[PDB]
């Protein structure tokens, strides 16, 4: 019976190139729910990181309303392949080095005209990092999200009201070289030469384990500096003692530094 | 109503393979605004760098003029998918190792017939580098831009009058191994065996932080050369002293150099 309802909707005068109607003439409200699957390849050198996520968008297209009140028809109808539905031309501004597969897509049409869009994407995103504090620093990488063609008069994004950003079970553990401390959903809507475009930015905060770098780098040299001191507690007459101590400690440090 | 205007234009005899008309019979003026998103992977070895940008081209096609004076119609109309508009066959001469996605495109048709073209591209561009001065050098990489098929009689590019080159908020910081000192928009129109083709070249200047390389490479060895001198202030009789000093310093330098 679902194929009979999808038939009734698109047999009409629906144009998937045409922006959905608004009662006020205002923009189309787009609710956004995001789900971070995995994060990897945090490239300090090439200023980029590989993140994999699941995006969920939600808007109201009154044209697609079949049941309206419904309550005698299925709540939503899964859209089958072959029917075009207008969607927000979403793109990632900071996306880089990206080739797109295709399908892992899901489109639901609720009776009131509410559409749910779900998609899986692998993205490489540029992340400017600052290494003044090494190795005890902290970086903040982001995923920007906006429309390309439609301005602020036609479309405006809003983070979903509850849990806008969700993370896979062991994401904090999953990362190879950093530890994820914080997440943050903010807005990054800005004004460019072409116009004012609504934009969402999700952000993760990575800091490194001080423990590792303490044991691997700091503690060894602390022992070497201490060793360089015990030549002071030897008398002046023992030339072979203090010469060997001094020159070896320096050779060791050069190796340690190497 | 925008779909009704786009209909009226292409319902006529518009050929997207035909160069737009000129009142003088002259070339088609193409204004170019460029925006450098991100720069990364500055490969010294393979002589190339990955740069990501947003190109804006602008020309006048009197055929597409719908409102002319307008002032009673929308200033511009966004081009929907399915309509072909003649565009400058722009290509990057120095582009290398490049695969193209697809869409991140934007086409506006102003009432007077002015067209705006916006596009996002990731490019790998060959950059000949000279390392006579290491590490205190400076490199200049460029992005060349020209038409392939059309000669100087049909099309001529001109940098936009104001801020032809624009850079993302933290580009100077974004770079991993170099520091961007200068930017420059010039012309590189040349004359080849096939003809005279108009060409735009944007240029960035990268030089390295002397500070780092000073502390990491130079200062350590300065200490080693000084150490080699203190064997002179020891008397001749102390054979174990000056032998150990001399041979260790040399071993250390070989390691340091390694």
């Amino acid at each position, epitope marked *: 019976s679902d194929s009979k309802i999808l038939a009734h909707l698109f047999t009409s005068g629906y144009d998937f190139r045409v922006r959905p109607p608004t*009662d*006020n*003439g*205002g*923009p189309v*409200v787009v609710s956004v729910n995001m789900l971070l699957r995995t994060i990897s390849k945090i490239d300090v050198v090439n200023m980029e990181y590989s993140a994999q996520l699941t995006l969920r968008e939600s808007w109201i297209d009154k044209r697609l309303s079949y049941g309206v009140k419904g309550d005698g028809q299925p709540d939503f109808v899964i859209l089958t392949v072959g029917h075009q539905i207008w969607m927000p031309d979403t793109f990632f501004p900071n996306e880089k080095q990206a080739y797109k597969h295709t399908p892992n897509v899901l489109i639901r049409i609720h009776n009131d005209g509410t559409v749910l869009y779900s998609v899986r994407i692998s993205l490489v995103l540029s992340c400017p990092m600052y290494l003044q504090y090494y190795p005890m620093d902290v970086q903040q990488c982001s995923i920007d999200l906006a429309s390309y063609a439609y*301005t*602020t*008069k036609d479309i*405006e994004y*809003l983070w979903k009201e509850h849990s806008p950003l969700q993370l896979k079970v062991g994401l904090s553990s999953s990362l190879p070289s950093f530890q994820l401390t914080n997440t943050s959903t903010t*807005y*990054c*809507t*800005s*004004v*460019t*030469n*072409t*116009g*004012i475009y609504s934009c969402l930015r999700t952000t993760i905060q990575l800091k490194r384990e001080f423990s590792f770098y303490l044991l691997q780098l700091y503690i060894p040299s602390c022992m070497l500096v201490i060793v360089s001191w015990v030549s002071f507690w030897f008398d002046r007459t023992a030339i072979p003692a203090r010469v060997t101590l001094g020159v070896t400690t320096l050779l060791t440090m050069t190796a340690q530094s190497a | 109503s925008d779909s009704k205007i786009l209909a009226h234009l292409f319902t006529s005899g518009y050929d997207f393979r035909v160069r737009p008309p000129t009142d003088n019979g002259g070339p088609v003026v193409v204004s170019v605004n460029m925006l450098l998103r991100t720069i990364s992977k500055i490969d010294v070895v393979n002589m190339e760098y990955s740069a990501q940008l947003t190109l804006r081209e602008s020309w006048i096609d009197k055929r597409l003029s719908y409102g002319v004076k307008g002032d009673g119609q929308p200033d511009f109309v966004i081009l929907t998918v399915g309509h072909q508009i003649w565009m400058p066959d722009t290509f990057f001469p120095n582009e290398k190792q490049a695969y193209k996605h697809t869409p991140n495109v934007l086409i506006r048709i102003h009432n007077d017939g002015t067209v705006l073209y916006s596009v996002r591209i990731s490019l790998v561009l060959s950059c000949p580098m000279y390392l006579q001065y290491y590490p205190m050098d400076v490199q200049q990489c460029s992005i060349d831009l020209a038409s392939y098929a059309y000669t100087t009689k049909d099309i001529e590019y001109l940098w936009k009058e*104001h*801020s032809p080159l*624009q850079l993302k*908020v933290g580009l100077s910081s974004s770079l991993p191994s170099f520091q961007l000192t200068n930017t420059s928009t010039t012309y590189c129109t040349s004359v080849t065996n096939t003809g005279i083709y108009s060409c735009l070249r944007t240029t960035i200047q990268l030089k390295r932080e002397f500070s780092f390389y000073l502390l990491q490479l130079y200062i350590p060895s300065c200490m080693l050369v000084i150490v080699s001198w203190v064997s002179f202030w020891f008397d001749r009789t102390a054979i174990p002293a000056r032998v150990t000093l001399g041979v260790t310093t040399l071993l250390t330098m070989t390691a340091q150099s390694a």
Partner: antibody
Amino acid sequence: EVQLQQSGPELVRPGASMKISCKASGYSFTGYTMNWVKQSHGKNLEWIGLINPYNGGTSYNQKFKGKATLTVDKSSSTAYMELLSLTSEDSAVYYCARDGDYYRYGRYFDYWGQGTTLTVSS
Amino acid sequence: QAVVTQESALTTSPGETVTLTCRSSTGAVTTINFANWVQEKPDHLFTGLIGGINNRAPGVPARFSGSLIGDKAALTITGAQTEDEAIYFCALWYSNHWVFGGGTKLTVLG
């Protein structure tokens, strides 16, 4: 603290045109976008348009298309506003208002200038 | 296009709670209107208060607070002060531009 010192009041005749200055101080100028508001005697507070010192882009109200022209000089930390074809109507007090978010349009008003009284009569 | 309607003028006592409304003519004031509130001191002095999604201008008292009571924008001052006596303007975002209102003349009786 921050400051937005505008230009001194001007007296000009209909048909002419002039430019109102607005110097910024106390913050990274290229960071926050700038607004411009018209306070006329007859009408309520009207909104002219806005400008991004870093982008250089501008977006005007539909009413003020051609009436106002926002510009900016990064070297002096100052936003400008030309007013062409001045008449008896354009006589008002003009304020410049900063946005509140750092390198992004947060769509909310921060600091205002003291304003500039423009008296245009013949 | 549309018009923003504020109260003519309101009166309150020091230490009390007062609420200014901001009605839209197109319909309900939603989150996409980014209701702003600007305070006009005498001699043409303006300063922003609440705006955007939850943003506040630096140096805005805690007694000031934004909300959406009913279907219009609300500026609530819990614990009014003598210096909070000024004219309060609210602005709404309609797709591409700001639309101010009439402005409410708040009086804190000294």
